[PDB]
């Protein structure tokens, strides 16, 4: 198939990614597309969906039948059960026992958004925490084990939880080298060390003058997903490249990529990232759903609102792929990621930004 040739609907994704990155000096990984699913579930729960209505608008498509078929299509493309990779997006409302969940709402949540709702007693936060964390494990094959503590449930009535799980094999795996530690030149402070992997191959690549960054595409098996790496030039920082990234400028930067011989050096890393999404959503202007005027009348039989939104994701990158442990294996450009960089995972048939993140200090 090759890289995506259409126009991505990534305005919200990039706005939100930027807000998260600007508030963390660490490694980050999240699923921007999954945050849009969450917002659309909340939109479906509001009577407005026939000011909460206005903010949630780069996410809505704004007729409700088009919205559901859109998200349902993109979810099923990304998760499509297949032999080459495993991807699961899981979303649950954990609802206090006194709330009557409307059955037609459970129906649309499962049908179009691959989401569910579950009753808990928040008067027993220890029990509730355990229930939510066992759900996370069940739906990420144990890769993630916990997302909340009793203390993070204090005062909660409805908690909305999203996790994502991905296992994928590189189309072009790296050779395994036993001992390949080298320096890594982080943004702040003296250099660290990281374990690296290196290969030569044919990859879509450009040195973007517009963004001040090299861009590299490493595809996964299955003719659907690929990982993009944006490596700021040495004169530039991740934060400067980020300020240059927007829907149009990222569109053009990918547009300019073509297949080239590239020597690729990447650090290996493994981490998870969890975030309560209320504050960053409010920072990007999504405020009414957290206000005293928020309501969920199409979800909860009548006033209640979402208390807290949580998202977590794990990432493991090595020679074989993403969470991969077994496999089957001169004008060269040099892409040597020994400085911080940005990455994302895209459904190349539709443009979906399934994962986004940055590496500030790679630890494996």
Swiss-Prot record:
Pfam families named in the record: Serpin
Glycosylation sites noted in the Swiss-Prot or TrEMBL record: 263, 293
Any one of the GO BP annotations: negative regulation of proteolysis
Lineage top rank: taxon: Eukaryota
Gene3D superfamilies assigned: Alpha-1-antitrypsin, domain 1, Antithrombin, subunit I, domain 2
Coiled-coil ranges per UniProt: none
Motif (Hinge region): 320-324
Summary of subunit composition and partner proteins: Forms a covalent heterodimer with protease CLIPB9; the interaction inhibits CLIPB9 protease activity. Forms a covalent heterodimer with protease CLIPB10; the interaction inhibits CLIPB10 catalytic activity. Interacts with CLIPB4 in the hemolymph of immune-challenged female mosquitoes; the interaction results in CLIPB4 inhibition.
Family membership noted in the UniProt record: Belongs to the serpin family.
UniProt protein name: Serine protease inhibitor 2
Protein's organism: Anopheles gambiae (African malaria mosquito)
Gene: SRPN2
């Amino acid at each position: 198939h090759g890289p995506f040739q259409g126009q991505r609907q990534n305005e919200f994704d990039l706005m939100f990614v930027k807000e998260i990155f600007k508030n963390h000096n660490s490694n980050v990984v999240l699923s921007p597309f999954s945050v849009k699913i969450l917002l659309t579930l909340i939109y479906e729960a509001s009577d407005t969906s026939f000011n909460t209505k206005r903010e949630l608008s780069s996410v809505i498509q704004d007729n409700i039948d088009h919205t559901r078929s859109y998200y349902k299509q993109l979810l099923e493309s990304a998760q499509q059960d297949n032999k080459d990779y495993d991807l699961n997006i899981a979303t649950n409302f954990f609802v206090d026992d006194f709330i009557e969940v409307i059955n037609k709402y459970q129906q649309i949540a499962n049908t179009h958004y691959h989401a569910m709702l579950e009753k808990v007693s928040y008067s027993n936060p220890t029990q509730t925490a355990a229930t939510i964390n066992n759900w996370v494990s069940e739906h990420t094959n144990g890769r993630l084990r916990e997302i909340v503590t009793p203390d993070s449930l204090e005062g909660a009535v409805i908690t909305l939880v999203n996790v994502i799980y991905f296992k994928g094999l590189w189309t072009y795996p790296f050779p395994e080298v036993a001992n390949n530690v080298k320096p890594f030149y982080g943004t702040r402070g003296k250099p660290t060390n990281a374990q690296y992997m290196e290969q030569n191959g044919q990859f879509y690549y450009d040195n973007s003058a517009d963004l001040g960054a090299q861009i590299l595409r490493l595809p996964y098996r299955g003719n659907k997903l690929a990982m993009y790496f944006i490596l700021p030039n040495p004169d530039n920082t991740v934060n400067q490249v980020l300020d240059r990234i927007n829907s149009a400028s990222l569109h053009q930067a990918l547009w300019y990529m073509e297949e080239n011989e590239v020597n690729v050096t990447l650090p290996k890393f493994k981490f998870d990232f969890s975030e309560q999404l209320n504050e960053p959503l409010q920072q990007v202007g999504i405020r009414e759903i957290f206000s005293q005027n928020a309501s969920l009348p199409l979800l909860a039989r009548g006033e209640v609102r979402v208390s807290r939104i949580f998202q977590k994701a794990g990432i493991t990158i090595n020679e074989l792929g993403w969470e991969a442990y077994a496999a089957t294996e001169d004008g060269v450009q040099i892409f040597n990621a020994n400085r911080p960089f940005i990455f994302f995972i895209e459904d190349e048939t539709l443009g979906t930004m399934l994962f986004a993140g940055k590496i500030e200090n790679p630890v494996f």
